[PDB]
Design a protein around this motif. Structure first.
Motif, mmCIF file in Angstrom:
data_model
loop_
_atom_site.group_PDB
_atom_site.id
_atom_site.type_symbol
_atom_site.label_atom_id
_atom_site.label_comp_id
_atom_site.label_asym_id
_atom_site.label_seq_id
_atom_site.Cartn_x
_atom_site.Cartn_y
_atom_site.Cartn_z
ATOM 1 N N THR A 1 1.506 19.397 -6.419
ATOM 2 C CA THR A 1 1.811 20.510 -7.311
ATOM 3 C C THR A 1 1.204 21.783 -6.747
ATOM 4 O O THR A 1 -0.007 21.886 -6.575
ATOM 5 C CB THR A 1 1.263 20.273 -8.735
ATOM 6 N N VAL A 2 2.059 22.747 -6.438
ATOM 7 C CA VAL A 2 1.612 24.011 -5.885
ATOM 8 C C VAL A 2 1.796 25.092 -6.937
ATOM 9 O O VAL A 2 2.883 25.251 -7.497
ATOM 10 C CB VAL A 2 2.423 24.383 -4.615
ATOM 11 N N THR A 3 0.721 25.820 -7.219
ATOM 12 C CA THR A 3 0.764 26.900 -8.192
ATOM 13 C C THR A 3 0.366 28.191 -7.489
ATOM 14 O O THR A 3 -0.658 28.248 -6.808
ATOM 15 C CB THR A 3 -0.229 26.672 -9.356
ATOM 16 N N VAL A 4 1.193 29.218 -7.632
ATOM 17 C CA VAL A 4 0.892 30.506 -7.033
ATOM 18 C C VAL A 4 0.460 31.419 -8.169
ATOM 19 O O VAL A 4 1.278 31.844 -8.988
ATOM 20 C CB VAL A 4 2.121 31.104 -6.326
ATOM 21 N N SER A 5 -0.837 31.699 -8.227
ATOM 22 C CA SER A 5 -1.387 32.549 -9.277
ATOM 23 C C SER A 5 -2.606 33.314 -8.775
ATOM 24 O O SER A 5 -3.191 32.973 -7.745
ATOM 25 C CB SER A 5 -1.777 31.691 -10.491
ATOM 26 N N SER A 6 -2.980 34.357 -9.508
ATOM 27 C CA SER A 6 -4.140 35.160 -9.140
ATOM 28 C C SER A 6 -5.377 34.548 -9.787
ATOM 29 O O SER A 6 -6.497 34.736 -9.312
ATOM 30 C CB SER A 6 -3.952 36.600 -9.616
ATOM 31 N N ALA A 7 -5.153 33.801 -10.866
ATOM 32 C CA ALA A 7 -6.221 33.144 -11.610
ATOM 33 C C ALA A 7 -7.105 32.274 -10.724
ATOM 34 O O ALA A 7 -6.795 32.042 -9.552
ATOM 35 C CB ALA A 7 -5.629 32.304 -12.725
ATOM 36 N N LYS A 8 -8.208 31.795 -11.295
ATOM 37 C CA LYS A 8 -9.140 30.946 -10.562
ATOM 38 C C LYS A 8 -9.199 29.537 -11.146
ATOM 39 O O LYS A 8 -8.872 29.318 -12.313
ATOM 40 C CB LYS A 8 -10.538 31.585 -10.547
ATOM 41 N N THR A 9 -9.618 28.585 -10.322
ATOM 42 C CA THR A 9 -9.711 27.192 -10.732
ATOM 43 C C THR A 9 -10.734 26.955 -11.843
ATOM 44 O O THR A 9 -11.802 27.562 -11.859
ATOM 45 C CB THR A 9 -10.069 26.317 -9.535
ATOM 46 N N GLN B 1 0.835 -1.233 0.000
ATOM 47 C CA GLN B 1 0.000 0.000 0.000
ATOM 48 C C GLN B 1 0.861 1.272 0.000
ATOM 49 O O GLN B 1 1.960 1.291 0.568
ATOM 50 C CB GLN B 1 -0.952 -0.013 1.211
ATOM 51 N N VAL B 2 0.362 2.325 -0.649
ATOM 52 C CA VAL B 2 1.078 3.596 -0.729
ATOM 53 C C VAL B 2 1.430 4.098 0.667
ATOM 54 O O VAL B 2 0.549 4.355 1.496
ATOM 55 C CB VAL B 2 0.243 4.668 -1.461
ATOM 56 N N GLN B 3 2.726 4.257 0.910
ATOM 57 C CA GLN B 3 3.211 4.688 2.212
ATOM 58 C C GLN B 3 3.120 6.178 2.553
ATOM 59 O O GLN B 3 2.915 6.533 3.712
ATOM 60 C CB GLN B 3 4.632 4.166 2.396
ATOM 61 N N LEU B 4 3.257 7.047 1.561
ATOM 62 C CA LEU B 4 3.169 8.486 1.803
ATOM 63 C C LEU B 4 2.119 9.126 0.891
ATOM 64 O O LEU B 4 2.327 9.259 -0.319
ATOM 65 C CB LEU B 4 4.538 9.149 1.581
ATOM 66 N N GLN B 5 0.992 9.526 1.473
ATOM 67 C CA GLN B 5 -0.078 10.143 0.697
ATOM 68 C C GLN B 5 -0.076 11.657 0.743
ATOM 69 O O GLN B 5 -0.166 12.254 1.807
ATOM 70 C CB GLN B 5 -1.446 9.637 1.159
ATOM 71 N N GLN B 6 0.012 12.269 -0.430
ATOM 72 C CA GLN B 6 0.014 13.716 -0.552
ATOM 73 C C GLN B 6 -1.091 14.142 -1.510
ATOM 74 O O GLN B 6 -1.373 13.440 -2.484
ATOM 75 C CB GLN B 6 1.335 14.210 -1.147
ATOM 76 N N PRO B 7 -1.728 15.296 -1.253
ATOM 77 C CA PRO B 7 -2.795 15.810 -2.121
ATOM 78 C C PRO B 7 -2.169 16.160 -3.472
ATOM 79 O O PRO B 7 -1.014 16.567 -3.530
ATOM 80 C CB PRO B 7 -3.269 17.058 -1.383
ATOM 81 N N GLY B 8 -2.928 16.018 -4.550
ATOM 82 C CA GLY B 8 -2.396 16.306 -5.872
ATOM 83 C C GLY B 8 -2.094 17.750 -6.224
ATOM 84 O O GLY B 8 -1.144 18.019 -6.961
ATOM 85 N N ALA B 9 -2.882 18.692 -5.715
ATOM 86 C CA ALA B 9 -2.642 20.088 -6.054
ATOM 87 C C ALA B 9 -3.189 21.104 -5.071
ATOM 88 O O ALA B 9 -4.058 20.806 -4.254
ATOM 89 C CB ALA B 9 -3.194 20.380 -7.436
ATOM 90 N N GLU B 10 -2.660 22.318 -5.175
ATOM 91 C CA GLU B 10 -3.059 23.429 -4.329
ATOM 92 C C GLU B 10 -2.831 24.727 -5.094
ATOM 93 O O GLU B 10 -1.727 24.980 -5.582
ATOM 94 C CB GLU B 10 -2.215 23.457 -3.055
ATOM 95 N N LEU B 11 -3.877 25.538 -5.214
ATOM 96 C CA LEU B 11 -3.765 26.828 -5.883
ATOM 97 C C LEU B 11 -3.592 27.838 -4.754
ATOM 98 O O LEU B 11 -4.303 27.771 -3.751
ATOM 99 C CB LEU B 11 -5.035 27.141 -6.681
ATOM 100 N N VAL B 12 -2.641 28.755 -4.905
ATOM 101 C CA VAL B 12 -2.377 29.750 -3.872
ATOM 102 C C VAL B 12 -2.241 31.153 -4.469
ATOM 103 O O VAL B 12 -1.525 31.350 -5.449
ATOM 104 C CB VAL B 12 -1.069 29.411 -3.096
ATOM 105 N N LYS B 13 -2.937 32.119 -3.874
ATOM 106 C CA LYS B 13 -2.882 33.508 -4.326
ATOM 107 C C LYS B 13 -1.603 34.131 -3.791
ATOM 108 O O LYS B 13 -1.237 33.908 -2.635
ATOM 109 C CB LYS B 13 -4.071 34.309 -3.787
#
Lengths: 212, 219, 103, 106
Positions: free
Chosen positions: B113-121, B1-13
């Protein structure tokens, strides 16, 4: 802070040949060096720990050696699945550090591209958009050109291209060319063609389709 | 089983902050350290810092501006990394890895994957790609699906829920007007389609959406 | 049961515990300090034994304040433990020599 | 006698940008390196001790790093008040020695 130098940055080899990646430490670190593999879009994967110790699940093809300041990671009989980025990492002194990385590249036999053109989908047309997609798959070398003709005349506007890295399944490359137009621009034109020019042939490979 | 679980993405202003998570499973020892590594597209691995859960102490890379704060919840086996006051320079894939106190990173997470942008999802629009009526076919046939108008990266494309792995090319996305676009292609024996179904699964972590789209020949 | 022999054992068990805790704490204290080498558990344990017996090869040694404080505890526990064994061997010889004279 | 090399001698940067001064020791000195700031007509002022330890009263903008033979003094978001001469000094071996200095220019 220990500096790890990986040179050359790119290594080209022929299928089945033996390959060697080098990693040089700025100061003597015993055998506290570890190797990682990272395929395109993948996370790093431990290959060799402590310079030469095998890890279970790793093809016996991989081996490491060295001590002090010079380390080598070797692959005996390279193959497509080995195409990736290779990193060394030291744990002798704090903080742990990583090398800059070495890309493995394979040189296979020349291969012409398989071209395919696709008319926009009815679902997209429903939303007032039109995208004509064209695939230039599994060719080699990576060098290749794509041209668009609308009703016989060359088109350069609205064409966005994308290239994939060397495929870890067959050592080839692939590319995509996308011509996006509004349903209007698209509806007032007959045929659309995609032309690929590649070293494997003096004559270009073309694919077309008529809107009707 | 997958040992380290991380969320796929995060949008940040820009200027805002985010808290990445990494939950573990499998054998956990008092000597474990959880590391965080930052990777910028096209670049290499950069060590950010570490933390020892059983104790709670954390150390950080001194050569770089400190934008991280590590903590660990022993009860739920989760390590967290707080990034704050981010700018475009902070956009990257952040991996967490587990080290048994013997110096090497035995296992890594899939990375966030972390993206820092002003744009919206924006979830993606998935369109089919079936051969045209005049396209003659040989022993193989190439099909595919178009994914456009999404933000931020990334999107994961599979065929027949992963059962169809051989013959697949998913091209790198292109950016135009704060929206990404890419296509994936797949090749199967010409005789197998369309008797045997061929579907493309597209997941877009940032908008918690995963849509399917069957590829049928043009009427 | 003879105290000197009991204290010797207690001393051994205690030393083994100090070695393990010292290995753990040394790593905990040294990580975060640039240039530190006492940072992985297996060698830290070798270092602690190396210190407790007072051999001190110099292949590994603490550079931080808390690492050094841990080192002192390890040195002292080792010196005390082995010193206590010597003392017990003295009591055994003294007692038996008394017998060899009758008493 | 330990030699401390500070190169380049002059560093130009744009307001708010990140800047880095380098100091190289002729032999390994652990983290026994200290940084000083000297404005025009002023006396030296301790900024960082032991390569990366903060001093009270010094803007959090300043940070140091390194060990062995290579050391870096960093300023995150340079500004006019930072215009000065920067010196490294080692205390690993006797006698103490100073680097030649690096001028910050905006």
């Amino acid at each position: 802070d220990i500096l790890l130098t990986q040179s050359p940055a790119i290594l080209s080899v022929s299928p089945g040949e033996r390959v060697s990646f080098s990693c040089r430490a700025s100061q003597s670190i015993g055998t506290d060096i570890h190797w990682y593999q990272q395929r395109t879009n993948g996370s790093p994967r431990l290959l060799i720990k402590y310079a030469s110790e095998s890890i279970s699940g790793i093809p016996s093809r991989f081996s490491g050696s060295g001590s002090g300041t010079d380390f080598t990671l070797s692959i005996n009989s390279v193959e497509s699945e080995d195409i990736a980025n290779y990193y060394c990492q030291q744990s002798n002194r704090w903080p742990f550090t990583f090398g800059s990385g070495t890309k493995l590249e394979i040189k296979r036999a020349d291969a012409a591209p398989t071209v395919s053109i696709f008319p926009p989908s009815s679902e997209q047309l429903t939303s007032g958009g039109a995208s004509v997609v064209c695939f230039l798959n599994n060719f080699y070398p990576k060098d290749i050109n794509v041209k668009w003709k609308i009703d016989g005349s060359e088109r350069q506007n609205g064409v966005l291209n994308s290239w994939t890295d060397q495929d870890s399944k067959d050592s080839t490359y692939s590319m995509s060319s996308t011509l996006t137009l509004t349903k209007d621009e698209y509806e007032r034109h007959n045929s659309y063609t995609c032309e690929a020019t590649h070293k494997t042939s003096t004559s270009p490979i073309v694919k077309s389709f008529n809107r009707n | 089983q997958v040992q380290l679980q991380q969320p796929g993405a995060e949008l940040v202003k820009p200027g805002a902050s985010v808290k990445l998570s990494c939950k573990a499973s499998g054998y956990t020892f008092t000597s474990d350290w959880i590391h965080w590594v930052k990777q910028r597209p096209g670049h290499g691995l950069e060590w950010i810092g570490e933390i020892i859960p059983s104790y709670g102490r954390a150390n950080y890379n001194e050569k770089i501006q400190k934008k991280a704060t590590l903590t660990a919840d022993k009860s739920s086996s989760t390590a967290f990394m707080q990034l704050s006051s981010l700018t475009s320079e902070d956009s990257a894939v952040y991996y967490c890895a587990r080290e048994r106190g013997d110096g090497y990173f035995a296992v890594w997470g899939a990375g966030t994957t972390v993206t820092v942008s002003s744009a919206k999802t924006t979830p993606p629009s998935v369109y089919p790609l079936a051969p045209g009526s005049a396209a003659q076919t040989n022993s193989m046939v190439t099909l595919g699906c178009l994914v456009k108008g999404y933000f931020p990266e990334p999107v994961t494309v599979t065929w027949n829920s992963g059962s169809l792995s051989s013959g697949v090319h998913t091209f790198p996305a292109v950016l135009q007007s704060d929206l990404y676009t890419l296509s994936s292609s797949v090749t199967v024996p010409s005789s197998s389609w369309p008797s045997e179904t061929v579907t493309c699964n597209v997941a877009h972590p940032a908008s918690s959406t995963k849509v399917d789209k069957k590829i049928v020949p043009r009427d | 049961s003879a105290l000197h022999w009991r204290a010797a054992g207690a001393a051994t068990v205690l030393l083994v515990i100090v070695l393990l805790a010292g290995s753990y704490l040394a790593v905990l204290a040294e990580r975060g300090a640039p240039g530190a080498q006492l940072i992985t558990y297996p060698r830290a344990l070798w270092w602690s034994v190396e210190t407790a017996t007072t051999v001190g090869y110099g292949d590994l040694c603490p550079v931080t304040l808390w690492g050094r404080l841990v080192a002192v505890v390890v040195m002292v526990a080792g010196i005390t433990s082995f010193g206590l064994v010597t003392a017990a061997l003295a009591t055994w010889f003294v007692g038996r020599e008394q017998e060899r004279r009758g008493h």
